[PDB]
Write a protein that binds this DNA or RNA. Structure first.
Lengths: 91, 93, 93, 92
DNA sequence: CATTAACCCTTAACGTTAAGCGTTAACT
DNA sequence: AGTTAACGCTTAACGTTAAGGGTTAATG
């Protein structure tokens, strides 16, 4: 239930089109470990990257961004979620 | 029109709508006063641990705050390198 | 004999023992802030240069550190595809 | 102190002793011919992997290899940086 | 008070640099 | 054949700019 925006790039744009991380940052005109570290589930999706990524693969920008925010949000919960209702229950 | 910072929302639809204050709103979420204000001043963004805190406290889907941030972020990466990117990258089309 | 990042050693025997931070130690070694913070979070490794600054400051042999990094990489490699490597290579006997 | 590439070792006291040639070794180890040879020539080091394969093949500890490389790495950092690091740092 | 400009720690994303790979195609 | 360019991919380590966050203080 936390899916990295990475896994999605790899498991379906890279692999589908048989593009390498090295070749992708070459198209995106960003450096090599930029695209590689997002692929490895070690970096996230900046908004500069979701603009590049969406431009290339013909998708909306938010699509990457919302792939991110579900990853970031899943990860704040299950780290501190219940330790927050026991903190703020108000309205 | 496009860039609108999630703070602008917290004032105008939640604080301004409930006669609530920042120092007041820090206390509820159980975080520091300078973090609620700096969002409200529009000099800081929504983190996920934040959006969970505002989500729970205003009976809001946490995905709504992060989306307010989601867009405001893209808005300003366009218009800062928007024309740059569109020139550097040709699609897979 | 099992996989322990050297970073684990750094906080559990040194930082916590002498009440120092990542940020404070990095200033004392003359490296930038995440060069020490990343080792502590078990996300970067002890390079020779890092292993020599660590030696000096904490009056230890640099070998000490480079062997905590030796063990960590070995154990990482093995099982990642040890046995498998044992299952590809006859020795000379 | 003095630096000694782990190649020197695998060559002098391993590959000369047992009449194995680099491109032979590469095979038994199931690794490409330029890794073993680039290690012999002293232009590449022993990765954590290589250690394990060389150690397996030669009935030694993968440690043994990494320690050779720990020490070639150290002696090379020192000297190239040794002094100014001791000078810009003060212990406790 | 409630709000701020002070710092300080930690930490994400970026471009550089450079090291280990295998693949290929030379040479020796 | 063995030895080795010379490609290209991956991936580690670094300084750096800059973000969120809680101290504290100054302010209003």
């Amino acid at each position: 239930r936390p899916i990295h925006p990475g896994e999605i790039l790899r498991d379906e744009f890279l692999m589908e089109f048989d593009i390498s991380p090295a070749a992708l940052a070459r198209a995106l005109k960003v450096s090599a470990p930029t695209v590689n570290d997002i692929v490895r589930e070690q970096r996230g999706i900046s908004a500069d990257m979701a603009i590049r990524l969406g431009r290339y693969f013909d998708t909306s920008a938010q699509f990457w961004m919302n792939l991110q925010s579900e990853y970031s949000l899943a990860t704040a919960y299950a780290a501190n979620g219940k330790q927050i209702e026991h903190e703020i229950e108000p309205l």
